[PDB]
Design a binder for this molecule. Structure first.
Ligand SMILES: CCCCCC/C=C\CCCCCCCC(=O)O
Length: 130
């Protein structure tokens, strides 16, 4: 999953609104989130990762070590417990909370494919390298 490193910007999104409804995001925040075109900046050093997700207004930062659970507060304010793993080319972010989510990032054809899963919802957000 080493190629995930660098800076990325949203290029396409499918079913993000349904993902947001499923994790309980309110209408006002969903409208703002759907209207955003975020960047992700990903740094990797060994099993040390950080990811900064930015819009012009609001940023979130997380840092973690592969395999080691950490406390995370999502952009929408949910408190969760997250453990990140590597499965081949993908880094998978297993988020435990109310509800659980699984977020995977994998580079395919030079684009970062992010897949956000909650219940039976599958959201796909594709990012291009900046
Ligand atoms: C992520 C911070 C800016 C938006 C604030 C949170 C709004 C809605 C919750 C979105 C879920 C967070 C996952 C976004 C993944 C991404 O686009 O990179």
């Amino acid at each position: 999953a080493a190629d995930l490193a660098g800076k990325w910007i949203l290029e396409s999104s499918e079913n993000f609104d349904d993902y947001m409804k499923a994790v309980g995001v309110g209408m006002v925040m969903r409208k703002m989130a759907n209207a955003a075109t975020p960047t992700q900046e990903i740094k990797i050093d060994g099993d040390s990762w950080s990811i900064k997700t930015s819009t012009t207004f609001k940023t979130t930062d997380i840092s973690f070590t592969i395999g080691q659970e950490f406390d995370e507060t999502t952009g929408d304010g949910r408190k969760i417990k997250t453990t990140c793993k590597i499965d081949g080319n993908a880094m998978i972010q297993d988020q435990k909370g109310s509800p659980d989510s699984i977020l995977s990032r994998e580079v395919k054809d030079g684009k970062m494919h992010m897949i956000l899963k909650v219940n039976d919802v599958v959201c796909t957000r594709i990012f291009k390298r900046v």
